[PDB]
Design a protein around this motif. Sequence first.
Motif, short mmCIF file in Angstrom:
data_model
loop_
_atom_site.label_atom_id
_atom_site.label_comp_id
_atom_site.label_asym_id
_atom_site.label_seq_id
_atom_site.Cartn_x
_atom_site.Cartn_y
_atom_site.Cartn_z
N UNK A 47 -15.15 17.70 -27.22
CA UNK A 47 -14.21 16.73 -26.67
C UNK A 47 -13.33 16.14 -27.76
N UNK A 48 -12.19 15.61 -27.36
CA UNK A 48 -11.25 14.90 -28.22
C UNK A 48 -10.76 13.64 -27.49
N UNK A 49 -10.75 12.50 -28.18
CA UNK A 49 -10.35 11.22 -27.63
C UNK A 49 -9.77 10.32 -28.72
N UNK A 50 -8.47 10.07 -28.67
CA UNK A 50 -7.77 9.34 -29.70
C UNK A 50 -7.89 10.06 -31.05
N UNK A 51 -8.18 9.36 -32.15
CA UNK A 51 -8.31 9.96 -33.47
C UNK A 51 -9.60 10.76 -33.66
N UNK A 52 -10.47 10.83 -32.64
CA UNK A 52 -11.82 11.39 -32.75
C UNK A 52 -11.88 12.77 -32.12
N UNK B 100 -5.34 7.43 -22.80
CA UNK B 100 -5.53 8.25 -24.01
C UNK B 100 -4.97 9.67 -23.84
N UNK B 101 -5.10 10.26 -22.65
CA UNK B 101 -4.46 11.53 -22.25
C UNK B 101 -2.94 11.42 -22.07
N UNK B 125 -19.08 2.95 -29.36
CA UNK B 125 -18.02 3.86 -29.79
C UNK B 125 -16.66 3.15 -29.97
N UNK B 132 -18.82 6.96 -36.57
CA UNK B 132 -17.88 7.53 -35.60
C UNK B 132 -17.52 6.49 -34.54
N UNK B 133 -16.28 6.02 -34.56
CA UNK B 133 -15.75 5.04 -33.62
C UNK B 133 -14.24 5.15 -33.49
N UNK B 134 -13.70 4.50 -32.46
CA UNK B 134 -12.27 4.33 -32.20
C UNK B 134 -12.01 2.94 -31.62
N UNK B 143 -5.05 -0.33 -25.73
CA UNK B 143 -5.05 1.13 -25.89
C UNK B 143 -3.63 1.70 -25.82
N UNK B 147 -1.98 3.57 -29.11
CA UNK B 147 -1.51 4.95 -28.89
C UNK B 147 0.02 5.07 -28.82
#
Lengths: 95, 606
Positions: A47-52, B100-101, B125, B132-134, B143, B147
Amino acid sequence: LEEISNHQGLTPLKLAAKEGKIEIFRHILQREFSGPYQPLSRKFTEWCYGPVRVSLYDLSSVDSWEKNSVLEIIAFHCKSPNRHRMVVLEPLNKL
Amino acid sequence: RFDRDRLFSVVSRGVPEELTGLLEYLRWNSKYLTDSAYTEGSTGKTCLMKAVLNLQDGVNACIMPLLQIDKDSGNPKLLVNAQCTDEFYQGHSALHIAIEKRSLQCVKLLVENGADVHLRACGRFFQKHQGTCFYFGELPLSLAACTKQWDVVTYLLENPHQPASLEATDSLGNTVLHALVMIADNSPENSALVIHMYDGLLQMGARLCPTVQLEEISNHQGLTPLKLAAKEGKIEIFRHILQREFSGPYQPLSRKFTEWCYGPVRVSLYDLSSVDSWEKNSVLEIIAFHCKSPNRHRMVVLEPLNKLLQEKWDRLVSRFFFNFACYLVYMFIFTVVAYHQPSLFGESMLLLGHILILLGGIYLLLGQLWYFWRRRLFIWISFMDSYFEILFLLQALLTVLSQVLRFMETEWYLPLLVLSLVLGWLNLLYYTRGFQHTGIYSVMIQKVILRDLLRFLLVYLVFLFGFAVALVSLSREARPYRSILDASLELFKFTIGMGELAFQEQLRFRGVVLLLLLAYVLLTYVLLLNMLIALMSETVNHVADNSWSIWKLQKAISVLEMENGYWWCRRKKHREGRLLKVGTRPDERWCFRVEEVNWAAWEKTL
Ligand SMILES: CCCCCCCCCC(=O)OC[C@H](COP(=O)([O-])OCCN)OC(=O)CCCCCCCCC
Ligand SMILES: CCCN(CCC)S(=O)(=O)c1ccc(C(=O)O)cc1
Ligand SMILES: CCCN(CCC)S(=O)(=O)c1ccc(C(=O)O)cc1
């Protein structure tokens, strides 16, 4: 074709480690494709979500559980100045 | 059947017609699409999240009928407002996936069907940490801002179904403006785009929230967006907020107002509201004492802070040199009493000298305990660069301890009095910051050498001890080196140039003892050669000298301490600038006038 071994027992990925060829080594090791060629990948984005990005990397020739693996080769069979640049690539760095 | 594994594979294909009969199965079982039976494993992730993860050319045709099917099922916990529930993804929702999409079409479709615009994606997360976080804030609007989606930001802010409140806050109390400050990086590509995103949200706050001061909203740490940019050390967004100027409708959103301009000269009023040290927990206190970052010395040299700290310094430089002269007189008395000690009118003057040293030692002990009491919450930040605040506490403790041991008459008072005399004069180097020439040199000299010598010392002490136990063991047999201390000292003398290297006549193994010294010398001089070349390789890099600005920060820390007066006489703070009308809110603010002359920038505008 990448499981074919030369007379030293090396596959193309293992030969790229022994010869210290970081650019082709990094490319084979992290390779990802879409559509017909997906099974030729060694990296699969989960999976990919934002910068991750989360990715599965294929460890077949790589994990030190196998005798004459890529990690054993970089440490003990590679002659080159490049060895220290090869252990800091993914998945090898996290592994 | 319409189990979860059929539904999740159906909505992934984007064909809506394969949902035919899902209504009948849900009604006949009395179940809902937000019950556990319709969720992905080890989380709360629903069929709607599975649908929004699989957009085709920007839309999924299953979402509209899937939302009707939920609406026709009579669900008490609507499918748009259901969230993930595990410790990492808690509060994550289909609307956070849609944003985010980057699908404005899907954001519209969700919000038109009543998706709550104020859902907080608050699980680990989405928190800020070293793993590992956003972090984006926690809200759909934060958001969309992080973005960089104006069209989505505009839609969330001013749609008729549920407008996003610009006053809304995450679990830390951060508004979208705190979220943009958290997400700023000091690179030119990030910071320029965060500055545009911040300004347009602030300009939209003047339409949507016209009575609300969005930059006076405080998070749970009590920080406004400007104060947070100082604590997090974000120079580019900090500089932008601090110096911000607008014309026309948005003039009251300025912090800088040009009063007049003539040739290369601009005169500007700068707004000091959160900035002047008259306020508790102000931007100047934050940069000095609450900020952790390397960037602090670059922040105190911005306008208005540079002229504002010069104005404060000029009002206090006579207090700085009075404090230095008292400490010189205390160190003169300390020296004249440590010299002229008796064997272990002149006798009563010696007793007076001991009482003045006791009182000066108690005064400094109380003054430094008050410093660490005031700085308690950020105590490491309040000494990491400011190492003298520990050395003054240590000199004061050792001064009180040495007079206590002298009243006990134990002769160990003298090595404590002499240690506190050495520290006393070393502490006199604090005041070298009062002048530019000595105060910049005190910043040129002290550096990264303190980090690497503590690493070299481990290598040097394994050599020194390893050879000392050996020369002692071998020099024991007859045909220097009497003890581990004596051999460590004889081997240490080789580094000060006093080596005493010789073929010892009386030792049985004298050739092997000489080969052990030649081995130690060669290995140690190879090590010192490696150490000097390693230090040159990191420290001789050509980086332009940042000592003037680190000295300006030392003067800022000094000022912000002096403005409180003393632990016994706590000074009433004077307020900087003037109360001036800058426009209509009238818009009356404590403004501070800066005059800039800049030929090099002005000539490029001709
Ligand atoms: C409690 C009621 C009595 C008050 C008496 C007067 C106090 C003056 C205080 C003062 O000048 O302190 C200077 C110095 C500490 O320097 P610093 O706080 O700026 O910086 C500290 C480091 N951060 O501290 C000293 O030099 C020690 C003070 C005692 C000696 C006075 C000698 C006077 C000669 C004229
Ligand atoms: C384990 C949850 C993963 N999520 C992101 C973390 C919040 S997710 O949003 O469900 C997602 C995102 C992107 C993709 C993809 O790119 O294929 C798939 C799933
Ligand atoms: C206090 C006198 C200021 N002067 C310049 C100094 C000689 S001024 O010429 O009067 C002037 C110039 C420019 C503006 C403006 O840009 O708004 C206003 C006034």
